[PDB]
Structures are given as C-alpha cells and as structure tokens.
Homo-oligomer: A and B are copies of this chain.
Amino acid sequence: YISTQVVSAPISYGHFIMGKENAVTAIAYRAIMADFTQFTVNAGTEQQ
C-alpha cells in the first residue's frame, strides 16, 4: 500500500500585512479584526 506520490506543496510562508485600518484599531482599541476591509465592504450589503 506504499507508493511515492508527486505532490504540489507550498514552498514559502504565507503573508499577512496590516492596513491603515488595522493599524489605527490596534493603536486606539488594542485590537485587530482579520479581514477588516473585505468585512466592511460586505457589511451593509445583502451578502453579509
């Protein structure tokens, strides 16, 4: 039941970079929302 297989792996890290949004909330409210911008643009629309 053992065979070598050719797999398509990652080779580097992912990235996560703040925006100005998350920087200001981290400064003033001690906190971070992940996906604050994608979150906000879908906040008021139908597809929440």
Residues on A lying within 8 angstroms of B by beta carbon are 20-21, 23-25, 28-29, 31, 33, 36, 39-41, 43-44
Contact = CB atoms under 8 A, between A and B. Distances in A.
Contacts of A39: 24, 28
B21 A21 contact: yes
Q: How many copies does the complex hold?
A: 4
B31 A44 contact: no
A35 to B, nearest CB: 11
Nearest to A40: B20
Given A20-B40, A29-B33, 11 more contacts: A20-B44, A21-B21, A23-B43, A24-B33, A24-B40, A24-B43, A25-B25, A28-B33, A28-B39, A29-B29, A29-B31
